[PDB]
Design a protein around this ligand. Sequence first.
Ligand SMILES: CC(C)CCC[C@@H](C)[C@H]1CC[C@H]2[C@@H]3CC=C4C[C@@H](OC(=O)CCC(=O)O)CC[C@]4(C)[C@H]3CC[C@]12C
Ligand SMILES: CC(C)CCC[C@@H](C)[C@H]1CC[C@H]2[C@@H]3CC=C4C[C@@H](OC(=O)CCC(=O)O)CC[C@]4(C)[C@H]3CC[C@]12C
Ligand SMILES: CC(C)CCC[C@@H](C)[C@H]1CC[C@H]2[C@@H]3CC=C4C[C@@H](OC(=O)CCC(=O)O)CC[C@]4(C)[C@H]3CC[C@]12C
Ligand SMILES: CC(C)CCC[C@@H](C)[C@H]1CC[C@H]2[C@@H]3CC=C4C[C@@H](OC(=O)CCC(=O)O)CC[C@]4(C)[C@H]3CC[C@]12C
Ligand SMILES: CCCCCCCCCCCCCCCC
Ligand SMILES: CCCCCCCCCCCCCC
Length: 597
Amino acid sequence: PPFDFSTKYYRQSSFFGGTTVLDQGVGYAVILGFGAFFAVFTSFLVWLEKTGLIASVIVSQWTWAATILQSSNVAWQYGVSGPFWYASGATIQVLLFGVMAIEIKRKAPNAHTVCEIVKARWGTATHIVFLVFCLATNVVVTAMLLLGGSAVVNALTGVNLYAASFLIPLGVVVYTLAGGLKATFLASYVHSVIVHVALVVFVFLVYTSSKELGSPSVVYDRLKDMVAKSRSCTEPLSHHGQACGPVDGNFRGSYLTMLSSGGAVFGLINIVGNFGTVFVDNGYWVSAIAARPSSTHKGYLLGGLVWFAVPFSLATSLGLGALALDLPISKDEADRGLVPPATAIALMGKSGSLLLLTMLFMAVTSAGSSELIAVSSLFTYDIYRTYINPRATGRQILKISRCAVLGFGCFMGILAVVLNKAGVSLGWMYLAMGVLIGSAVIPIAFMLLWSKANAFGAILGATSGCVFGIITWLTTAKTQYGRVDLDSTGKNGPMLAGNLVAILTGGLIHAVCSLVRPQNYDWSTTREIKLREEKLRRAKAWIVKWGLVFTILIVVIWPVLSLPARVFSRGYFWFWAIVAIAWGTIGSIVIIGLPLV
Ligand SMILES: CC(C)CCC[C@@H](C)[C@H]1CC[C@H]2[C@@H]3CC=C4C[C@@H](OC(=O)CCC(=O)O)CC[C@]4(C)[C@H]3CC[C@]12C
Ligand SMILES: CC(C)CCC[C@@H](C)[C@H]1CC[C@H]2[C@@H]3CC=C4C[C@@H](OC(=O)CCC(=O)O)CC[C@]4(C)[C@H]3CC[C@]12C
Ligand SMILES: CC(C)CCC[C@@H](C)[C@H]1CC[C@H]2[C@@H]3CC=C4C[C@@H](OC(=O)CCC(=O)O)CC[C@]4(C)[C@H]3CC[C@]12C
Ligand SMILES: CC(C)CCC[C@@H](C)[C@H]1CC[C@H]2[C@@H]3CC=C4C[C@@H](OC(=O)CCC(=O)O)CC[C@]4(C)[C@H]3CC[C@]12C
Ligand SMILES: CCCCCCCCCCCCCCCC
Ligand SMILES: CCCCCCCCCCCCCC
C-alpha cells in the first residue's frame, strides 16, 4: 500500500469489475421511460403555456454527451490544460452561428435544409455529393452518443451492453414523435436548470464540502505526490496505462502546468472538429433558419459565455479529483467515458451516480432528438420531394417525416450494436471526426459567402480532401508504429496529420479551380426557394466586433499569460480553482434566475 488514503484498492487493473452500485431494474427504467416521461412533461408544459430565454435555448443545443465525458478524459491526462483546451471551442461557435444566421436571412429566407441551397446555387451532381457528406456527419455524431451512454449505463446498473445500444434510440424516437419538434421555449429552460444544478453541486462537492477532498490545498498536495520520481510503477504496483509517475510530454512531468504538448495537440484537433460540426451538420443549419437575428442577436454572446463554464468547471472538478483520489482507472476505461461515474461513486456513492445519470441522459435525449430531426427533413425535402415524387400535399409530407425518424432510429441501434462488438469507443470517434468530413467545410463556407466558387471545384476538393486525409492518417500510423489497428491509429500524431491534411486540401483545390474560372453569383436563385437590411447590417457589425475580442482574449492571450507560471504553486492553483468556481456559479445564477425576471 503505497498510499494511506487508497488502501482499499490494493494493483487493481480496473475500477468497474463487478458488484454494480445499482440494479438492472433502474437501468431498464432509465433507458426506457425517460422519453415518455419528458414527452408527458412537455405536453403539460405546452398546455400551461397556452436575452435570457434565447441564451437558455442556445445552451441547451450545445451540450452533448461528449461535453461531459470527453472533457474529463483529457483532464485525467495532461492535467490542468485539458479542460481549458476543450472549453476553448466556444467563442468560435458564437461567431459562426451569428454570421450564418445573419447571412441566411439576406440570401435564402425560405429554405429548410443546407442541401436545398447547394441545389439552387450549383447544379445537381454537386447536390448528391454534398448529400453524402451531410448524412455521414449525422451517422458519426449520433454513434458517439450511443456509445458513451450505453457504456455508462452498463458500468453503473449492470444492464447488458448490447441491449442498451438498441434500446436507447427507441426512447429518443418516442420523445421526438410526440411533442419535441423544438417543442416550446420552456423545455430548454428545464434542461438548462437541471444541468446547471447538477454542475453546481458536483463543483462545490470536491472543493469545499467533501471529507476526502475538501480544499484546493488537498488536491494540490495529492497531485504532486503522484508524479514523484521516487515512485515505482512496476508490475506488482501498477499496470501499463494507469497514471503512475511523471507525465510524458509535460514540463517536469507535472499535472499542474500549462506547458503540455498533448493538450496543445488536442486543442488543435478540437478546433478542426468544431469547425466540421458547424458547417456540415444539418441540425446547426436547422437551428439557424429559425433564429431572429435582427432583434435578438445579443443573446448568443451570453449563451456562449455561460456554456463555457460547463466543460471547464465539470472537467476541473471530476477530472482532477480522480487523480487526487488514486483511482485504478485504466486508459481503455477512461477512453470509453468512464471517468466521471468513477469519481461520482467514490465521492458521493449511490447518490452522485443517479445525479450523473440524470445529467447525462438529459443531454443524450436533447441532442438525439435534434439529430433525428436533421435527417427526416433531409430525406423529406432533398430526396423524396426532389426526386421520388415532386408534387406532394401536406398530408403526404407528414407521413414521410414520421417514417424517416423510425427508420433512422432503428438503423442506428444496429450500427451501435455492431460498433460496441467491434470495440470502438468514444474518444476514438471524437478525434476521427475531422479526418472524415473535414474536407467539406471550406466549400460550404465559400457557398455561403464567396461569390467566385464554382461547382466543379467544390466536388473536386470535397472528394480529394477525404481520400488524402485518410491516406495520410493511415500511413502516419503505419510509419510511426508497427501496425494499423484501433490502438496506434487513435494517437495524437496520426490524428493531427489526418485532420490537417483533410481540412487544408479541400479549401485549396476549391480556391484554385475557382480563381481560374470564376462563377460570379448574385444569390438571385437561392432567394426564390419555395428598413430591414439596416438592422441586419448593424447586428452583423456588433457580432463581428464583439465576438472577436473575446475569442482573442480567451484562445490566445490567456494561455500565453499562464506559461510564465511554469509549474503551478500553492497560491496560483487557488486562483485557478477560484476562477472556475466563480465562473460556474455566476453562469448558473444568470441562466436560472434572470429568465424569470
Ligand atoms: C491556438 C491553439 C489552439 C494552437 C496553437 C498552435 C501552436 C502555438 C502550438 C500547437 C502545438 C505546439 C507544439 C507542441 C509540441 C512541441 C514540442 C516541444 O518540444 C519540447 O520541448 C519537447 C522535447 C524534449 O524536451 O525532449 C517544443 C514546442 C512544441 C513544438 C509546441 C510549440 C507550440 C505549438 C506548435
Ligand atoms: C506518434 C505520435 C504520437 C508522435 C509523432 C507524430 C507527429 C509528431 C508527426 C508524424 C507525422 C507528422 C505530419 C506529417 C505531415 C503533415 C501534413 C502537413 O499538412 C499540410 O499542411 C499539407 C499541405 C497543404 O495541403 O496545405 C502538415 C504537417 C503534418 C501534419 C506533420 C505534423 C507532425 C506529424 C503529425
Ligand atoms: C510576438 C513576439 C515578439 C513576442 C511573443 C510573446 C510570447 C509569445 C513569448 C515572449 C517571451 C516568451 C517566454 C520566455 C521564456 C520562457 C521560459 C520558459 O521556461 C523554460 O522552459 C525554461 C526553464 C527550465 O527549463 O529550467 C517557458 C516559456 C517562456 C515562459 C516563454 C513563453 C513565450 C513568451 C511569453
Ligand atoms: C534577472 C533577469 C535576467 C531574469 C529575472 C527577471 C524577470 C524574469 C522578472 C523580474 C521582474 C518581473 C516583472 C515585474 C513586474 C512586471 C510589470 C507588469 O507590467 C504590467 O503589465 C503592469 C500593469 C499595467 O500597467 O497594465 C508585467 C510583468 C512584469 C514586466 C514582470 C515580468 C517578469 C520580470 C521582468
Ligand atoms: C521536461 C520534459 C519535456 C517538457 C516538454 C514541454 C513542452 C511544452 C510545449 C507546449 C506549450 C504550448 C503552448 C501553446 C500556447 C498557445
Ligand atoms: C524543455 C523546455 C521546453 C519549453 C518549450 C516552451 C515552448 C513555448 C512555445 C510558446 C508558443 C506561443 C505561440 C503564441
